[PDB]
Amino acid sequence: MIKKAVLPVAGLGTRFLPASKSIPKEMVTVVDRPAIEYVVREAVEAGIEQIILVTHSSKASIENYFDRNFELETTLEQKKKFDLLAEITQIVEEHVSVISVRQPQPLGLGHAVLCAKSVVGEDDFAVLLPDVLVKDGSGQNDLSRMISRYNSSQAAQIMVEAVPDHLVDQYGIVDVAQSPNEGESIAMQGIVEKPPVGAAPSNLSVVGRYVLPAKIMQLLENTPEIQLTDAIAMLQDTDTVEAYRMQGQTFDCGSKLGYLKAVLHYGLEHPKLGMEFKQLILELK
Amino acid sequence: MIKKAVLPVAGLGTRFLPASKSIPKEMVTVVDRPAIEYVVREAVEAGIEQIILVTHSSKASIENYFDRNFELETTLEQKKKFDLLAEITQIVPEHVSVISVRQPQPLGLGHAVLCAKSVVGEDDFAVLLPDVLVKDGSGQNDLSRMISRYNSSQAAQIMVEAVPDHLVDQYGIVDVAQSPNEGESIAMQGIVEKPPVGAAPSNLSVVGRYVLPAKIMQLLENTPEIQLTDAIAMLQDTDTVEAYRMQGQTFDCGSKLGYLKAVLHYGLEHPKLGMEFKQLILELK
Ligand SMILES: O=c1ccn([C@@H]2O[C@H](COP(=O)(O)OP(=O)(O)OP(=O)(O)O)[C@@H](O)[C@H]2O)c(=O)[nH]1
Ligand SMILES: O=c1ccn([C@@H]2O[C@H](COP(=O)(O)OP(=O)(O)OP(=O)(O)O)[C@@H](O)[C@H]2O)c(=O)[nH]1
């Protein structure tokens, strides 16, 4: 049914400096692999086949990480380290493509999703902000559940999560009737940015996953900084727009500090490293 | 007056994979800055004025990180974001030069140091392996100690530190008459590579920190593909060579568990993130 994700990655990482001065912020080493691995893996594990990096002139280290490296592949072999060889050989599944198009000047996410117009054609497509990680535990991920909900309903979906009632000013917060349950959706007439700490419509924050149709690109070319939330504003005129509520847990790798938080959570959960890792903490006082 | 330092960064970090598949294992972000910054910030602290990168074609990221980034610099005086701009200009004093030389083929540590002969000229010099981070809390880092000691003694200095008797076959370890006290040096008759767990002349791992006479250049052009501990022998005939035991802590950012250990110990002491980070940690158990 749904098989194109668009991943915007043209962002200068200003807040993630100097780490992101010379490499991209998408390649930040979370435990033992770059951040963009987990965001793609999420998409792959959901039923996506075609990844679409909207990318910048400087983020070639990204496209390259989904591709065969001759020089390494051949040194690994001469070492006889073939386990490790078969890591780098099969990062994505053999039946997944990774595509590039260029956001020429960085004029915000909305202008970035619009750069995929041509690759997305008439297909209904998800988005994933890769500066945000998501950690399902259930077994089936939040993008999995969200999509099947966009297959059933035909309503553009918007992933959101509950925050403390005293921190709703940091977040774009969705409007709704009542708050739908962990891993369900309910209609929504619009998102408010940094609402007043009282007088906020909901305690549910735009996370930065979306499943939209192609209508949306025609709208992006007519939004009076081009706003995605402006385009979903116009979609509402014609089409039902719901809020899919997470069951798992997000991480803001866009920020130095939500990055450190992510290293702790995934590191402890690392199939090999976790054991030896949990030890390295304990050992600290 | 030791004022030059060969940083060999031509490796392919197979041991630190796939982190370092598409970015150097030196550009790997410890807390908020890549790993190599800590090594240079160490070399500069100890009097170095010329940083000689023996590098590979996979590794512009590095040379660039020590350069003007034109889009970031000019974009951040648009936003008059003076604090973030601060974060990517001061990286090393105006007087510190960073010079690239290319290691065509990875035919050994030995063979890297010798690609820099051309540039080191007739002049005694230091060698710093980035794989390895060193941490002071003494107010004179281990390298400046070693350069105080080459200057007064005139005798080459091998930084070593002690390891459990049962991992000695994972290291070069040195032939010493006795163990030099944390912070001092003693003559040594030679080093061994990976001496079987029994036949180790000492517990002291060669760490990855050398001060050397510039005529080692001339003994690397004639060794039994080229090994340093080889050339440090041939000196060991003509001249005195001393093992300096280190007083500060040590982290291998070529091993995974070693990089994770550093994210923790460095991060807990970060000016800003430190107090906020420690917090994240107390919040897990
Ligand atoms: O013009 C833009 C803005 C943002 N984006 C993409 O949208 C996502 C959101 O990116 P962020 O909003 O976290 O910011 P940024 O990376 O542009 O830089 P800072 O504000 O942290 O300094 C990132 O993955 C980025 O690549 C673009 O592709 N183009
Ligand atoms: O022949 C050599 C050996 C070492 N080095 C320099 O030593 C440093 C790392 O030494 P390593 O031995 O860790 O390099 P590697 O990246 O090949 O990793 P392994 O999988 O072999 O463990 C790097 O900074 C590299 O440039 C060379 O440049 N050439």
Write the DSSP string, B38-67: HHHHHHHHTT--EEEEEE-TT-HHHHHHTS
Q: Does B92 touch chain A (CB under 8 A)?
A: no
Could you tell me which residues are beta bridge partners of residue B98? B51
What are the residues whose beta carbons fall under 8 Å from the beta carbon of B235, sequence distance 6 or more? B156, B212, B213, B215, B216, B219, B241
- Tell me which residue range forms the domain holding B79: 1-285
Q: How far apart are CA B194 and CA B215, in angstroms?
A: 26
Q: How far apart are CA B38 and CA B132, in angstroms?
A: 10
Please, which experimental method was used?
Answer: X-ray
In 10 A of CB B48, how many CB atoms?
25
User: Nearest to residue A264, comparing CAs of B263, B185, B144?
Assistant: B263
B131 in contact with ligand 2, CB cutoff 6 A: yes
**Helix H or strand E encompassing A78:** helix A70-79
**Helix H or strand E encompassing A282:** helix A273-282
Q: How far apart are CA A254 and CA A11, in angstroms?
A: 10
A130 in contact with ligand 1, CB cutoff 6 A: yes
Q: How far apart are CA A154 and CA A145, in angstroms?
A: 14
Structure tokens at A207: 């996370």
Is there a binding annotation on residue B76?
Answer: no
Q: How far is the CA of A194 from the centre of ligand 1 (A)?
A: 18
Q: How far apart are CA B17 and CA B3, in angstroms?
A: 34
Contact A5, A48 (CB under 8 A): yes
Contact A57, A24 (CB under 8 A): no
Could you tell me which residues are beta bridge partners of residue B7? B53
Q: Does A41 touch chain B (CB under 8 A)?
A: no
State the Cα angle at A192 between A187 and A196, rounded to 5°.
125
Structure tokens at B236: 């060991």
A54 in contact with ligand 1, CB cutoff 6 A: yes
Residue A198, CB half-sphere, CA atoms under 13 Å: how many? 0
Rounded CA Rg of chain B: 19
- The minimum CA-CA distance between B270 and chain A, rounded to whole Å, is 11
State the Cα angle at A16 between A10 and A17, rounded to 5°.
105
Q: How far apart are CA B196 and CA B169, in angstroms?
A: 5
What distances in angstroms separate CA A162 from CA A143, A165, A204, B214, one per listed residue?
17, 9, 4, 63
Strand bridging mode A157-162 / A242-245: parallel
State the Cα angle at B171 between B170 and B172, rounded to 5°.
150
Q: How far apart are CA A57 and CA A11, in angstroms?
A: 11
Q: How many A/B residue pairs have CB atoms within 8 Å?
A: 135
Could you tell me which residues are beta bridge partners of residue A211? A126, A157
What are the residues whose beta carbons fall under 8 Å from the beta carbon of B242, sequence distance 6 or more? B149, B153, B155, B156, B157, B158, B185, B186, B187, B188
Residue among A37, A61, A280 minimizing CB distance to B23 = A61
Q: How far apart are CA A191 and CA A173, in angstroms?
A: 5
Long-range pairs of A216-220 with CB within 8 A, sequence gap ≥ 24: A216/A113, A216/A156, A217/A113, A217/A114, A217/A116, A217/A117, A217/A120, A220/A110, A220/A111, A220/A113, A220/A114
Q: How far apart are CA B88 and CA A60, in angstroms?
A: 21
What distances in angstroms separate CA A194 from CA A14, A225, B81, one per listed residue?
21, 17, 21
Q: Collapse the DSSP code of A243 into the 3-class scheme (helix H, G, I; strand E, B; otherwise coil) and give the result.
A: strand
Q: How far apart are CA B167 and CA B149, in angstroms?
A: 29
Give the end-to-end CA distance of chain B in Å, rounded to a whole number.
Answer: 51
Residue numbers of A between 44 and 73 with CB closer than 8 Å to B: 58, 61-62, 64-65, 69, 71-72
Question: Helix (H) and strand (E) counts for chain A?
Answer: 11, 14
What are the residues whose beta carbons fall under 8 Å from the beta carbon of A190, sequence distance 6 or more? A174, A175, A233, A236
**Are the beta carbons of B264 and A284 separated by less than 8 Å?**
yes
What are the residues whose beta carbons fall under 8 Å from the beta carbon of A132, sequence distance 6 or more? A39, A207, A208, A209, A250, A251, A252, A253, A254
3-state helix, strand, coil in chain A (%, to 5): 35, 20, 40
| Ligand number, closest to the Cα atom of A59 | 1
Number of domains comprising chain B: 1
Backbone angles phi, psi at B283, to 5 degrees: -85, 30
Q: How far apart are CA A46 and CA A207, in angstroms?
A: 17
What are the residues whose beta carbons fall under 8 Å from the beta carbon of B195, sequence distance 6 or more? B168, B169, B173, B201
Rounded CA Rg of chain A: 19
8-state DSSP, B177:
S
Q: Does A33 touch chain B (CB under 8 A)?
A: yes
Structure tokens at B230: 């080889």
Q: How far apart are CA A180 and CA A202, in angstroms?
A: 11
Structure tokens at B13: 């970090």
- Buried b / exposed e over A16-45, threshold 16 CB at 10 Å, is bbbbbbbbbbbbbbbbbbbbbbbbbebbbe
Q: What is the resolution of this structure in A?
A: 3.2
What are the residues whose beta carbons fall under 8 Å from the beta carbon of B20, sequence distance 6 or more? A29, B13, B28
Q: How far apart are CA B137 and CA B141, in angstroms?
A: 8
Peptide bond preceding B18 in cis form (omega within 30 of 0):
yes
Contact B83, B57 (CB under 8 A): no
Q: How far apart are CA B272 and CA A197, in angstroms?
A: 26
Q: Does B76 touch chain A (CB under 8 A)?
A: yes
Contact B15, B254 (CB under 8 A): yes
